[PDB]
Amino acid sequence: QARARAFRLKSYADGDLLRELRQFDGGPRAFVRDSHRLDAAVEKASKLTDPTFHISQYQLPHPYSFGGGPPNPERPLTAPLISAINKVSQRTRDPVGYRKRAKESIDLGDFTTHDPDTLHPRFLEYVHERTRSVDGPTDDAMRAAQTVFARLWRRKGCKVKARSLSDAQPDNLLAIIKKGSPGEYRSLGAEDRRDPRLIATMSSSLLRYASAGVQVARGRPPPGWVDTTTQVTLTFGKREPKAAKIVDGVRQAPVPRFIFNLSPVNYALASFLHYDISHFLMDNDPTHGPGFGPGRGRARKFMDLVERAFDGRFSTPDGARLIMSDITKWDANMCEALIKYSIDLLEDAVDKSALSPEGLATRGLMYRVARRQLLEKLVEHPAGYFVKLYGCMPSGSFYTSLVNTTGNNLLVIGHAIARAVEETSLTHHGAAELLADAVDGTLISYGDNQLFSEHLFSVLGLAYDPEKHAEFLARFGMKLKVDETEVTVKLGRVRFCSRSLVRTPHGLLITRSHNSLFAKLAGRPRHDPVVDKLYVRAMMVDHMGTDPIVYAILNEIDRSLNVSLEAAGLTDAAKKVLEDTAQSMFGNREQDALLAVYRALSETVIDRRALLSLHTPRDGDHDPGRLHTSVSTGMHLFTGELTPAAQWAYECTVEKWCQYLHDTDQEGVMFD
RNA sequence: GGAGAUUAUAUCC
RNA sequence: GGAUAUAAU
Secondary structure, three states, rough: OOOOOEEEEOOOOHHEEEEEEEEHHHOOOOOOOHHHHHHHHHHHHOOOOEEEEOOOEEOOOOOOOOOOOOOOOOOHHHHHHHHHHHHHHHOOOOOHHHHHHHHHHHHHEEOOOOOOHHHHHHHHHOOOOOOOOOOOOOHHHHHHHHHHHHHHHHHOOOOOOOHHHHHHOOHHHHHHOOOOHHHHHHHHHHOOOOOOHHHHHHHHHHHHHHHHHHHOOOOOOOOOHHHOOOOOEEEEEEOOOEEEEEEEEEEEEEOOOOEOOOOOHHHHHHHHHHHHHHHHHHOOOOEOOOOOOOOOOOOOHHHHHHHHHHHOOOOOOOOOOOOOOEEHHHHHHHHHHHHHHHHHHHHHHOOOOOOHHHOOOOOOOOHHHHHHHEEEEEEEOOOOOEEEEEEEOOOOOOHHHHHHHHHHHHHHHHHHHHHHHHHHOOHHHHHHHHHHHHOOOEEEEEEEEEEEEEEHHHHOOOOOHHHHHHHHHOOOOEEEEEEEEEEEEEEHHEEEEOEEEEEEEEEEEEEEEEHHHHHHOOOOOOOOOHHHHHHHHHHHHHHOOOHHHHHHHHHHHHHHHHOOOOOOOHHHHHHHHOHHHHHHHHHOOOOOHHHHHHHHHHHHOOOHHHHHHHHHHOOOOOOOOOOOOOOOOOOOOOOOOOOHHHHHHHHHOOOHHHHHHHHHOOOOOOOO
């Protein structure tokens, strides 16, 4: 409707549409339309009964996709990291073992960029059989699992109410629209989702449901646009560090993740319907990961689960294990059946009882559209052409974390219920009432990342069984990697969102594995040398100074970068990352202030105390203390009190650390 | 040719 | 009311 109107091709089958597309095919990072990027996907889909993907009959004269290419090939941190590991490993208990374990990770360190010619093979992961619905036994279990969380949410105080359309007015809609992508409106001049003309368009796209609902509440049929309104979804490849893996010998360089950039109109509908229920779960649902962070008291849902399972010890007091589910490529494989159970449960938690009959019908039409649009997407493939995608989670939707987390939680509870009805004398209702009590404190998911206590199965009179867990997931087309799913009784192997917990004599302390740091460093492409030096310090911040080996290694790398730090001169990249420092030290961001900061940078050290202050919560019992440049350019001194356990970690040398982890059996935190 | 959502945190305005 | 940066999913 905006001059970009699509034309209809003549064919119907994918193989014939593909031939038709050649007639539109077109530096090395400008976009060129290329229908051959679809060849393998079309070939794969042709052998499937119910494929997740078809070529769209409708196409645009001009595509939205942009070109790309490979990153800078140099890896400037690999050599300094090796010297640092060479030195610090000598102060650990097994120096040659540490250096070998660490070399494995450095070798895998890599990096992905957006490039249409490397992105299209990743899309094959999204091309497989649909699972529209599951069989009777599984459905009964999944609907019982829905009652578990619905009960949990009510007990936790859920009082979320349906919004009125007053909140779809431009001035009120702003409070539930975050800044970000204009999606397909970027072609029309919009730069941000929160731009006033976009906000006006998103508002109109919500208010149009009012009169549609008036008709349905009178028993008339809905307007036609309700069932046909669609928005284009754009795609691109993720730019990030990513570790290669060794699969059957060959070291497999990483394929870029497939990212979806959804339309602001779809965003506005999702947020109008479900912003509140999402924020209620973040604040109050103990199984809901989103809201988590590693510092400042934000890991409490993780720590509460661990402390219920370990009660002060380093191994679980009973033998009850902890399970960390390892699922292959969650977003590509989340089927329509699981998406429906998840979003339906979320919509059910929203209280509609105060709505008028028109208001209720209006919300029903809005939900109808949001559900259909989560399930069936119109996606511009990196070939430069539209395809239709049924199921899969479109990573980048408003619903991504919310629905992935809800679905993973429903999987394990549905599985538990399914086993109980088959194997024991519990009914669906009876298993549900047990799990509703036991799930509070025994389960947490963050999308496909999951951690749960075997007590979920204990209270059903069952023991966890990974093959039965994998078989349940396979009913939804998902592959639980059984040999990579950690099952343990030891705190040192418990993980959540890439974080470990170390129990010190004064309490728990979030930490991170060393191998993850080494791969990221080995994968870092060459930037401006000041930018890269500040990246190494950002890594210190990410690790929060808990581990003195990690601090030592990073402090070594930081020093080593000083030899060549000034070789590029004061570039614009270096100016940008030094601006905050120049204004806090000299009052201005002018050339001389910036160069004074620049030339002093070689003289700075990042204080481990500043890093460990990040464990301090902002509690009204704790004042964490301002950091200024303490963890970036290092030109302020951090004054402030650490938490007891973090104070213990400051007083703790490489040598004391390895001894304590050895004596407590917590050395699992270092690797994996 | 000049790269999504969500969460957490830090810095500066 | 905004900007920049890193991490996680």
